[PDB]
Structures are given as structure tokens and as C-alpha cells.
Amino acid sequence: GSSGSSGKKPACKFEEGQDVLARWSDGLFYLGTIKKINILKQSCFIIFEDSSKSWVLWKDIQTGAT
């Protein structure tokens, strides 16, 4: 409400520079490295081996490296 803060957004559990598998528009997963993490859009700027940068959705970004 007015008095105090109401609500809160989660943290970017992801990591910067972490190699993961992102799902391209086609629907298939490709190898890429995490460059940025947007919580507002729930995406992450990953760079695929194809030197292509695309904002992948936190749900479309598969976390491999344990």
C-alpha cells in the first residue's frame, strides 16, 4: 500500500558469462554465452557461437553447467 513498500522482484539467478543453451525463434536450442540479464523483460543477452546476440527468455534459456 501507501505506507511502506508493496511487492518485490526476483533476482537474476543467472550469471554473466555463463555458457548455456538458448532456444532460438525456430524452437531449437543453441550454444551461447550469457552477456546480460534483464529482469523486467525476463530475458538474457546471450551470444551464440554464430556471434549472434539475441535476448533469450529466462524460460527459453536452459541452464546446463551445474
Residue with cell 539475441: 54
What's the grid cell of residue 5? 513498500
Report the alpha-carbon distance of residue 26 to residue 8 in Å, rounded: 33
Domains observed in the chain = 1-66 (2.30.30.140)
Report the alpha-carbon distance of residue 49 to residue 34 in Å, rounded: 12
Q: For Cα atoms 34, 61, 12, give the angle at the middle one, nearest 5 degrees.
A: 60
Report the alpha-carbon distance of residue 62 to residue 3 in Å, rounded: 40
Q: How was this structure determined?
A: NMR
